[PDB]
């Protein structure tokens, strides 16, 4: 199987471009040429490529130079017909940032973080991006009474509304999608899971502007289920941008390929994305890969890496798709009663009066009997996993 | 230190009467009375005692004997001068509800778990209740196939619109407390964090009658700072219970007495509650211990572990005043900024326009000089940590 | 594929005959009779079939009733041909060992825990077992101060002294297999790893009779991997028993069919135990399920769980050989020269002295040029997978 | 308080000089000078300091470059009269090392890191320092083939074997200690566990040169209960170092200040190392603090957090000694029996033969009614709890 421009694989400049420096050793690779990687991403089928301001230009360019770089940059676009879907903001590198961007302790980094990121806003817009990723990394805490949590969420309330009213003037029709994480690099991160950022973003003053983006990694740090949390995003409507990649449980963030973590997990993830409403997929957007390339490979790995990404989820596609025609699945589907929860628990024009009246609903109910027969649940997932392990 | 009803400590019938058959053997407690519980629970200085509806009146009591025993518990209640804050209903110990009450893929199971509830609230109702609390243990999944978690949240959803409706018309007047839990008993549970419950309760269709009810360790079996969370749920007004407990990580749910298992987040938690704006706690109802007293004890045991949990919640609350108290905490503090998170980003009437007018904000912007001052969060936590400890 | 006995596939009495009974509510299921399970197990695929004390004898039986169950349970064996490579007893059920059986802080309760192992060493003996696993789940504590750490481990090490001398004397010829989990029943339980339970083993006045029981799930709660440190304990050669089922990182003890949790590494395990060295097996004991068919199943569901353990199992070996076999995985192989770290480190005869004299080891090495040379580790590991999902 | 050279406190070079450079930002700090980091120290009371060949020696300096380093070094050393108690040797920062040192699949790596480690031994044999500790960061792996465990294995101890000979013909009478980590920066780490490492010891050739440097948060990075595992390798006679800090259960390593983390288990494990038996410490090597200042600081926080680590043992242990020597606690301890698991549980010359004998150990045991009584474990740990809050 290969990739098509359709099955919009996007890749941050970030990933392939990370230089493996980790937090206890010196960067074992060199640095990638922004045109270089378009031109390579181009090659293994990409169809866009995101980036952080300070990825494509180095933190204090001078406009000149700055000016440069863009024009350069927009070149190699044009050439390999590679398109810029989502766009976002280095708020954690820079040591100003330490305590936060748009929440740090001091009023001054906070209209700092605002400025940086209206810049990017305007850069963005320039190349067509439609969605800007706000990934609050620094957002957070070491120690509980170093954190106003209360007023923390009101100046990242305050922030957003403010980029929300400019991108609106200005016209730009951008989507904003916040990246919850639950820690790394602070001890605790401010909206730690997909749920703390949907209900923050229902707060918000142009709420239908505002979306999440979820990765995998993130929310199995904390040990939970990501596609269960995916499947409440899309219920909610807010999915606007997906970040995929793998991981080990509770660690630090390791960035894997996706499906190199919990296989499993990524396998009925790509079966909810794909295997949606009509026959259509129930998700749209770009599926990005936020990962790192291990710090133990060179070039040639790099760009393996990058493939295998796009290897695990075509894959995956392929068997979820097959689970889902096969006869003996649809019988285990029904025997599992799958889509009798799709029927309303209410008959039509049923109210609470009607539900009190009804004996059987209750005085004459056999709880007894329902609860011994079997769900057959263990078979229905044993068939799902012979499909994966391309066994039927 | 000594409770009064103003502490408004609470206890369910559960926790102390919890005969200690866990998942590996069998019950080390006789079965405690209700009208005992009332007088013993007096006694310790409660105000108030909840229960699951199965907890006072075994599950299949006809008419006539559920009818006593509700006149009796009427007594104790009338004697002690106890208030019932909250009730609950069972919707996980029966076989029947092994896939889930509201959720399970079963249509029957579904219509009985909300005829089990409306009773529940008939009866609450009656006692005085204020608050329903929905603890939906058995909605979820082992297996990712078996469970529509769209088709979940939808029949979530039917049944909780109706159980409002009832109210409103009956005119109970109650407020509706969904309580979120990552897992245990379902590999996975649907609404695994505060985060994920406040965003569902936000789609319902009369969302003002409904908020949370996070418990201690609930939020810790993934890891996160349940203080933090507290404070999300207090920023969005949606904190109408809560339940106190101890936990360590995650791990199976341990339900130690509070302050018995992460003894740092126990203080924060108490600090946030309790230091309110203006003096006054930033919480108002009850502070309601769901716990269990372990295995290894007896009715004795059972007793000092009823008082420790009120122990713990004064001694803390007394540290977390002399903390705020202290003009060196006070000092420290102001070193550290933490009020400045209070002060709007903006300047009155200023917008993006403003903003980007302003050099001092960017162009002119000094981010090494402020990346290089020290935010001084070590010492403000060490004093925090010497008040906690009666060393200052 | 289909099991053989060479296969040596074994199950527990208490795995297929759980009840259900969690720590949230009664079972679903109706009691296993011995017999019957020695007869579905037998049509399954089993070779072996093994038990706790309690599991065949219910606590409390009469010699006369206990002596019945025995001889009807020698038939069912006989007549099936099923074995009882191992036994086991339970010393975690019963409120006497809420603190313990053998390091109970009471010391009559650690005496009748002896009695108790004695006794069911003579039915072991006597049906032919050749191990006996010892799992303390009631070992460890709460709470630090309960628990002299270095006085249990002195009790368990004369508890286990003695079982050794005894068996000896009476010429049974087992070997006796610690298993090791980290928590649940207790808050934390003594040896926790597998790590910890051979250093303990070693400390053993008959070492050579003593080796470990790994469950998959023990060493996943804790987030460690599993097929690295069977690989460990093979390395030491304490690879007694081996207990497979899944586990979906840290949370309450799942029991799921064996692959249905870590997918990834339970193809690794599966490669480490099969493609061992000189072409055959690493490992040669019993491949033993200790895993639990879910709360939501009958006893169609039992019977298709405990057929899934055998499915899993055998696919996976499947792959695992697929993936050795392959010339391009023996390409990967080479390119990452995992072969090269079985070649000494030293040549033959080379001491520190030689080393220190060798300017090529330090004083000439260019560790800038090893540094930038990949491992192409990705590559081998997405080789891997591939095979795993049957894509190659 | 105030600490004394008696206290044994020491700081590796690299906790106050971490530059606060992480996975995700730039360094917030500018580096500091070796022989100003021995007088601060010396300041505020350690009484020795420790260092890697790295930290001191920048990598790649020029032997006369070095030597002179060395030579402030000592004369820092000698003005201050601090001492170097243990040496390390950073085999984890540069390039070379991206597939470990010792266990590298690269042949010619693991000649070099012996080489590297070889002449760190020798300064610190010129030094004094009495252990060296080895902290295998890079040996393991991303991926479960890349590295044969067994191979693996056998080239550690290869590497270890040859260094025990190097120091015993030099006379050095060094001690070595392992530190075992579960993972960061490898996906997984070999040795994960205190227990692991310990196992791994006792196969070395000269065993009782070995033992384990484990750390706080490394245990706690499993969920493990440090306390517990440090009163096990006591037990072991292998606690020949400690690295203490804090942490937050499994996330990142924190390297918090030392009682930041679980104050509840950094209780415990001062109660556990100071009231030994004989009224005396149960170890007498040095408190080592392997922290780092949070990111958020300056160097007044810096010295600010290196007194906390020290003020944080010394108000822990004044608690610990107070509980001990209180009338009320040691009733509780007698009430639950800690005292009696010291007593053996046969008999003076009783065997297995007078224990089958003994009749109330099993014929005539009540195990219900023993079963029954309680332990008092709940009001012994709020006592301990009082203790630390300086209740009592
Ligand atoms: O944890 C790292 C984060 O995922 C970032 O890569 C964001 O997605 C973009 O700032
Ligand atoms: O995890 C168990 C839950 O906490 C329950 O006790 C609810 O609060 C009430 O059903
Ligand atoms: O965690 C429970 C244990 O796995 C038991 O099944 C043992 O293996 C036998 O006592
Ligand atoms: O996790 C980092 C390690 O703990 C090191 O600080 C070692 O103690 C010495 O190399
Ligand atoms: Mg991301
Ligand atoms: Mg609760
Ligand atoms: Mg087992
Ligand atoms: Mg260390």
């Given at each position: 199987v290969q990739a098509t421009r359709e099955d919009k694989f996007s890749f941050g400049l970030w990933t392939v471009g990370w230089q493996a420096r980790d937090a206890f050793g010196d960067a074992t690779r060199t640095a990638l040429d922004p045109v270089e990687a378009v031109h390579k991403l181009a090659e293994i089928g990409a169809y866009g490529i995101t980036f952080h301001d300070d990825d494509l230009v180095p933190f204090g360019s001078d406009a000149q130079t700055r000016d440069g770089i863009i024009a350069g940059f927009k070149k190699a676009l044009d050439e390999t017909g590679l398109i810029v879907p989502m766009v976002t903001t280095n708020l954690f590198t820079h040591p100003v940032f330490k305590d936060g961007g748009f929440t740090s302790n001091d009023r001054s980094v906070r209209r700092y973080?605002?400025?940086?990121?209206?810049?990017?806003?305007?850069?963005?817009?320039?190349?067509?991006?439609?969605?800007?990723?706000?990934?609050?990394?620094?957002?957070?805490?070491?120690?509980?009474?170093?954190?106003?949590?209360?007023?923390?969420?009101?100046r990242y309330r305050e922030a957003l509304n403010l980029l929300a009213q400019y991108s609106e003037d200005r016209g730009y029709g951008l989507r904003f999608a916040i990246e919850p994480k639950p820690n790394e690099p602070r001890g605790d991160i401010l909206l730690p899971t997909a749920g703390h950022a949907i209900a923050f973003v229902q707060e918000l003053e142009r709420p239908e502007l505002f979306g999440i983006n979820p990765e995998?990694?993130?929310?199995?740090?904390?040990?939970?289920?990501?596609?269960?949390?995916?499947?409440?995003?899309?219920?909610?409507?807010?999915?606007?941008?997906?970040?995929?990649?793998?991981?080990?449980?509770?660690?630090?963030?390791?960035?894997?390929?996706?499906?190199?973590?919990?296989?499993?997990?990524?396998?009925?993830?790509?079966?909810?994305?794909?295997?949606?409403?009509?026959?259509?997929?129930?998700?749209?957007?770009?599926?990005?890969?936020?990962?790192?390339?291990?710090?133990?490979?060179?070039?040639?790995?790099?760009?393996?890496?990058?493939?295998?990404?796009?290897?695990?989820?075509?894959?995956?596609?392929?068997?979820?798709?097959?689970?889902?025609?096969?006869?003996?699945?649809?019988?285990?589907?029904?025997?599992?009663?799958?889509?009798?929860?799709?029927?309303?628990?209410?008959?039509?024009?049923?109210?609470?009066?009607?539900?009190?009246?009804?004996?059987?609903?209750?005085?004459?109910?056999?709880?007894?009997?329902?609860?011994?027969?079997?769900?057959?649940?263990?078979?229905?997932?044993?068939?799902?996993?012979?499909?994966?392990?391309?066994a039927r």
């Open positions: 973080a605002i400025r940086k990121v209206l810049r990017q806003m305007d850069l963005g817009a320039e190349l067509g991006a439609k969605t800007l990723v706000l990934w609050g990394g620094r957002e957070g805490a070491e120690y509980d009474s170093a954190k106003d949590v209360s007023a923390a969420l009101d995998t990694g993130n929310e199995q740090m904390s040990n939970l289920n990501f596609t269960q949390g995916i499947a409440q995003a899309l219920w909610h409507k807010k999915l606007f941008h997906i970040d995929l990649n793998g991981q080990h449980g509770p660690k630090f963030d390791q960035d894997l390929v996706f499906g190199h973590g919990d296989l499993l997990n990524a396998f009925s993830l790509v079966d909810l994305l794909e295997n949606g409403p009509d026959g259509a997929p129930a998700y749209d957007g770009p599926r990005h890969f936020d990962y790192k390339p291990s710090r133990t490979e060179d070039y040639d790995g790099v760009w393996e890496s990058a493939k295998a990404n796009i290897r695990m989820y075509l894959l995956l596609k392929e068997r979820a798709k097959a689970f889902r025609a096969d006869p003996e699945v649809q019988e285990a589907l029904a025997a599992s009663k799958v889509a009798e929860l799709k029927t309303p628990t209410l008959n039509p024009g049923e109210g609470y009066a009607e539900l009190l009246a009804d004996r059987s609903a209750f005085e004459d109910y056999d709880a007894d009997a329902v609860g011994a027969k079997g769900f057959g649940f263990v078979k229905l997932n044993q068939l799902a996993i012979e499909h994966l392990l391309g």
